Amino acid sequence: GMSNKFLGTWKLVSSENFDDYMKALGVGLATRKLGNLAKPTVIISKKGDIITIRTESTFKNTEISFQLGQEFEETTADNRKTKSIVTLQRGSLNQVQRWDGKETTIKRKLVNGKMVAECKMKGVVCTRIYEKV
């Protein structure tokens, strides 16, 4: 399963191309403003086989709980209602969200102790890097 090194409290330290990723998702300017300003905290936890990813920011929280490989309903921070699946590939924790025949991927991997999230929509790529408290 998921490496235990994913578990903990993560703080965003850099973000590349999030505005165009949000545009790709159809997010409007006021909400993009909040997304570009936020320095969220991402807490990854696990109890038995249930993985939880909680995101906290000054103006918005989200939380998902899932089992690997089992599709679940998700309401994203930009209010998309998606069918999502999280899988594990070469130790990368890979989330796919599907809605209205669209899809986006959020792939989270550990690189030299940091968590690197690659977000892709319509081939637009954003990279968000986190360090662990």
Residue 130, annotated as binding a ligand? yes
Q: Which of residues 33-52 bind Cl ion (CB under 5 A)?
A: 38-39
C-alpha to C-alpha distance for 107 and 27, rounded to whole angstroms: 20
Q: Rule CB under 5 A: say whether 58 interacts with Cl ion.
A: yes
Length reported for the chain: 133
Q: Rule CB under 6 A: say whether 44 interacts with ligand PLM.
A: no
C-alpha to C-alpha distance for 20 and 125, rounded to whole angstroms: 8
C-alpha to C-alpha distance for 102 and 6, rounded to whole angstroms: 28
Task: Kindly state the smallest distance separating residue 59's Cβ from ligand PLM, in Å.
Answer: 6
Scanning 1-9, 44-52, 71-79, 81-89 for contacts with ligand PLM by CB under 6 A, the matching segment is: 71-79
**Alpha helices for the chain (secondary structure H):** 18-25, 29-37
Q: Rule CB under 6 A: say whether 40 interacts with ligand PLM.
A: yes
Whichever of 27 and 85 has its CB closer to ligand PLM, that residue is 27
Alpha carbon distances (Å) from 13 to 27, 88, 93, 131: 22, 24, 19, 7
Task: Kindly state the smallest distance separating residue 74's Cβ from ligand PLM, in Å.
Answer: 11
**Residue written as token pair 């070469």:** 90
User: Residue numbers of the site for Cl ion (CB under 5 A)?
Assistant: 38-39, 57-58
Binding residues for (9Z)-octadecenoate: 108, 128-130
